[PDB]
């Protein structure tokens, strides 16, 4: 068993609850530790993964510690609220202030795109973002399942290439294109 | 990249035609709009411009256009025609996907252009052709389905779209 401990962070309302839920209902299967942690364990290119997902940002002792539990962070907005992305620059800033010296993986995620109508952000806007501030990006939907399969294999991708060797990410990498 | 392939389609043709009712359509119902959808088993961010007024610059944003005209209205096939041209002249180096749209096939008692000389012309244009109701929804998921599939056939390996057309056909039939 291979550990991935992965936190939502993001404003009120931007749908890590959601996502949280949608994740855990898709997958079979830390119960001690209350109802905003899930456990799901995953395959990613041909080995097991072990994710702990917590979703305590809300305003109880790992809520005050959010910061500094996660191998890796997932930083929510709403496509449909400027607010939302711009809080994200706040957890960016927030968070890298937290753990100065680690390459902690960061995904900035702009969720409910399947909101077309009432977009706010463009994917575009989201995109340059990432790029700018050294992320990743992706956008997803928890009403339509939209990348959230995506988002979790990613999560791990990213976790175990800041872990593991140049070789074992080759053949895992390999493994992914054939 | 990372969970996400894009598409820029651009709406071209003339006022009226219904552009901006296929836009509407596109976006579940304000110049763009954003969505991703499933084509063949895979996710396509299409990004769909909707700005063209009756020029040389929005000939060379889009990876793909749609020119549409309207079955009712033969003029508007004319310019869509022309559209047409100038695009392929616009883009010299590339092979640039189009679809020419036949919009308002409900309108079955006020149609002017008729289905043969449509698919006709887009034969002589080298181009595809689809006939629309943005009133009505008919064809228009096939229509972006499509645009998709055609920017596929030029960016990607030739493998990845033999496995889409095996996907698709096992899907039809
Ligand atoms: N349309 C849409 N609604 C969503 C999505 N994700 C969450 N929601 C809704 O947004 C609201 C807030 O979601 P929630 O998970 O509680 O947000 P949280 O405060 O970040 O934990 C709820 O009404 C959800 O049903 C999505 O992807 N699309
Ligand atoms: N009957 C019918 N009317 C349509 C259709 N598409 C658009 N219209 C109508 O045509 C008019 C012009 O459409 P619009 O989207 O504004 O055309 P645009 O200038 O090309 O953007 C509107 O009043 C629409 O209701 C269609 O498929 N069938
Ligand atoms: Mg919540
Ligand atoms: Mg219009």
Same mark, same amino acid.
Request: with cysteine; charged share 30%; aromatic share 8%.
């Given at each position: 068993?291979?550990?991935?401990? +992965? +936190?939502?962070?993001?404003?009120?309302?931007?749908? *890590?609850? $959601?996502?949280?839920?949608?994740?855990?209902?898709?997958?079979? #299967?830390? @119960?001690?530790?209350?109802?905003? $942690?899930? @456990?799901? $364990?995953?395959?990613?290119?041909? %080995? #097991?993964?072990?994710?702990?997902?917590?979703?305590? /940002?809300?305003?109880? /002792?790992?809520?005050?510690?959010?910061?500094?539990?996660?191998?890796?962070?997932?930083?929510?907005?709403?496509?449909?609220?400027?607010?939302?992305? %711009? *809080?994200?620059? @706040?957890? !960016?800033?927030?968070?890298? !202030?937290?753990?100065? $010296?680690?390459?902690?993986?960061?995904?900035?995620?702009?969720?409910?795109?399947?909101?077309?109508?009432?977009?706010?952000? #463009?994917?575009?806007?989201?995109?340059?973002?990432?790029?700018?501030?050294?992320?990743?990006?992706?956008?997803?939907?928890?009403?339509?399942?939209?990348?959230?399969?995506?988002?979790?294999?990613?999560?791990?991708?990213?976790?175990?290439? !800041?872990?593991? #060797?140049?070789? *074992?990410?080759?053949?895992?990498?390999?493994?992914?294109?054939?």
């Amino acid at each position: 068993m291979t550990y991935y401990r +992965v +936190v939502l962070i993001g404003e009120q309302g931007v749908g *890590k609850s $959601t996502l949280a839920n949608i994740f855990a209902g898709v997958h079979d #299967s830390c @119960e001690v530790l209350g109802e905003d $942690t899930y @456990e799901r $364990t995953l395959m990613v290119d041909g %080995e #097991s993964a072990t994710i702990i997902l917590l979703d305590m /940002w809300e305003n109880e /002792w790992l809520h005050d510690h959010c910061m500094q539990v996660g191998d890796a962070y997932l930083i929510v907005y709403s496509i449909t609220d400027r607010a939302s992305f %711009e *809080k994200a620059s @706040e957890l !960016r800033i927030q968070l890298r !202030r937290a753990r100065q $010296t680690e390459d902690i993986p960061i995904i900035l995620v702009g969720n409910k795109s399947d909101l077309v109508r009432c977009r706010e952000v #463009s994917v575009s806007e989201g995109r340059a973002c990432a790029v700018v501030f050294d992320c990743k990006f992706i956008e997803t939907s928890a009403a339509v399942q939209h990348n959230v399969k995506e988002l979790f294999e990613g999560i791990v991708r990213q976790v175990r290439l !800041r872990r593991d #060797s140049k070789e *074992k990410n080759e053949r895992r990498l390999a493994y992914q294109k054939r």
